[PDB]
Amino acid sequence: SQDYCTMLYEWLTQGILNDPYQEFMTYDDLERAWDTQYFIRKDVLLRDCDSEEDKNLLFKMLRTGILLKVVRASLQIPTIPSNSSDITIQEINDFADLMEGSNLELYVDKCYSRANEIFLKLFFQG
Amino acid sequence: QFDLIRLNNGTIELNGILTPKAEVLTIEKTLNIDELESVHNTFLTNILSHKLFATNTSEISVGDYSGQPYPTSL
């Protein structure tokens, strides 16, 4: 799961989608025209998307990366540094632990909060 | 400061992404060689794109009652 986790991390902290083998949920078009459709590969999900709680989590993860994607595009930068916010997020180095319950949601919430912190600073200042 | 494109349908398009202000979280629109040539070609093309000069094409309406390209009559 180590690379999977890395891929997830970058999605959530950088807004980077990089999936050459099509293993990640959240794929889009093109590879202007920024309002593209995102697709959820139900079949590669870690959890079902039938419960309300997991749907909400999936969407939060999705939004997190999108806001970051917007910021990277807006600032014309390859990456958003940790010092861009007061929220710094560690890498996922233990998948099994992340999947132990509650930890995933919080990890994502931190990522999400950070994405909004950065995003909003841009929108209300930039 | 806004680079705006006017479209024939009235749309004013910002030419690209709206950039942030100088205040950020952390130049001149000059032309290059091809761009200069392009502007010039565009210009001459535009002169000759006016309907009255399209004498080399079936697209020119050949007058209406005379049946001829406007320059024939002119």
UniProtKB/Swiss-Prot annotation, chain A:
Gene name tied to this protein: SPC97
Protein family (similarity comment): Belongs to the TUBGCP family.
Included range, full protein: 276 to 412 of 823
Species annotation: Saccharomyces cerevisiae (strain ATCC 204508 / S288c)
Protein name, as recorded: Spindle pole body component SPC97
Assembly information from the UniProt record: Interacts with TUB4, SPC72 and SPC98.
Known function: Involved in microtubule organization by the microtubule organizing center, the spindle pole body (SPB). Probably part of the microtubule attachment site at the SPB.
Other notes: Present with 2230 molecules/cell in log phase SD medium.
Cellular location(s): Nucleus; Cytoplasm, Cytoskeleton, Microtubule organizing center, Spindle pole body
Swiss-Prot record, chain B:
Organism superkingdom: Eukaryota
Disulphide bonds in the chain: none
Subcellular location, record wording: Nucleus; Cytoplasm, Cytoskeleton, Microtubule organizing center, Spindle pole body
Remarks, miscellaneous: Present with 56 molecules/cell in log phase SD medium.
SUBUNIT field: Interacts with TUB4, SPC72 and SPC97.
Role of this protein: Involved in microtubule organization by the microtubule organizing center, the spindle pole body (SPB). Probably part of the microtubule attachment site at the SPB.
Family membership: Belongs to the TUBGCP family.
Protein name (Swiss-Prot/TrEMBL): Spindle pole body component SPC98
